[PDB]
Amino acid sequence: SSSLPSFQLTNTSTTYCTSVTNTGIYSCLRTTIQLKREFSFYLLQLYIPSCMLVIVSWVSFWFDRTAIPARVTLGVTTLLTMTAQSA
Amino acid sequence: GINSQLPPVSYIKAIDVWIGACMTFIFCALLEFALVNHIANAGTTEWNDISKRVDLISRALFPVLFFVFNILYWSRFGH
Numbered sequence: 001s002s003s004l005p006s007f008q009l010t011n012t013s014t015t016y017c018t019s020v021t022n023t024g025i026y027s028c029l030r031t032t033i034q035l036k037r038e039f040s041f042y043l044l045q046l047y048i049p050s051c052m053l054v055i056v057s058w059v060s061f062w063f064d065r066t067a068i069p070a071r072v073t074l075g076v077t078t079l080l081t082m083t084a085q086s087a
Numbered sequence: 088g089i090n091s092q093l094p095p096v097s098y099i100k101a102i103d104v105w106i107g108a109c110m111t112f113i114f115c116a117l118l119e120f121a122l123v124n125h126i127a128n129a130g131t132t133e134w135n136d137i138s139k140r141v142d143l144i145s146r147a148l149f150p151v152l153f154f155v156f157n158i159l160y161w162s163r164f165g166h
């Protein structure tokens with residue numbers, strides 16, 4: 001688990017997968033590990049920064065309606081950045 | 088860029104604390120712009136000079152706070 005940083009090995013199972021083929025019936029075992037993706041990364045590199053990006057788009061609601069350049073610059077920049085991050 | 092050369096982990100790295108903080112100082116700068124500009128266009132001169140006051144305070148408070156942060160940060164992770 002220490003050499004597996006990105007996931008968390010939650011459960012394992014030991015089963016049989018014997019199957020019938022055209023050349024005959026072959027005995028078969030199957031071991032199965034269950035990997036749960038770590039969330040800390042995606043919280044910090046995706047969710048948090050996107051909220052922070054969406055929240056920025058709101059601070060333009062507090063700029064006077066006359067200064068529209070400021071509003072557009074915010075709304076547009078956050079939108080572009082949103083795209084980049086997703087890419 | 089930095090986070091791209093790293094494996095997704097389950098803990099908060101010291102790098103994260105430093106990026107996140109600088110992120111905030113810039114976010115609050117924007118917030119300040121809005122606050123200042125909003126109370127500025129208010130008809131009364133009562134708010135107008137308050138608007139001026141916020142800038143004066145910010146011009147010093149921000150650097151000071153950022154300096155304080157650096158001190159706390161480096162003492163905590165430079166050890």
Ligand SMILES: CC[C@H](C)[C@H]1O[C@]2(CC[C@@H]1C)C[C@@H]1C[C@@H](C/C=C(\C)[C@@H](O[C@H]3C[C@H](OC)[C@@H](O[C@H]4C[C@H](OC)[C@@H](O)[C@H](C)O4)[C@H](C)O3)[C@@H](C)/C=C/C=C3\CO[C@@H]4[C@H](O)C(C)=C[C@@H](C(=O)O1)[C@]34O)O2
Nearest residue numbers: 044045048049051052090099103104106107108110111114
């Ligand atoms: C707080 C979100 C809002 C939107 C704020 O965002 C900003 C400013 C605007 C808003 C107020 C910007 C944001 C940082 C935050 C400030 C956050 C910190 C200074 C640190 O984190 C805080 C909160 C965190 O818990 C959310 C908490 O961890 C706890 C709780 C967790 O579980 C709930 C748990 O997992 C954990 C184990 O223990 C932590 C101790 O302390 C710091 C760690 C955050 C770093 C953030 C980032 C670093 O690189 C990321 C990315 O490369 C990028 C481009 C944007 C950054 C960002 O998004 O910057 C980024 O994602 O503020």
Ligand SMILES: *[C@@H]1O[C@H](CO)[C@@H](O)[C@H](O)[C@H]1NC(C)=O
Nearest residue numbers: 010011012013014032033034
């Ligand atoms: C792990 O645990 C749960 C509960 O026992 C079970 O439903 C799941 O199928 C298991 N996964 C594996 C891969 O063994």
Ligand SMILES: CCCCCCCCCCC
Nearest residue numbers: 143144145146147148150
């Ligand atoms: C009374 C106001 C004095 C403001 C000084 C601001 C200095 C900022 C320096 C940032 C490096």
Ligand SMILES: CCCCCCCC
Nearest residue numbers: 108111112115152156
């Ligand atoms: C650790 C976050 C510090 C944010 C300070 C912001 C001051 C305007």
Ligand SMILES: [Cl-]
Nearest residue numbers: 073076077080
């Ligand atoms: Cl631009």
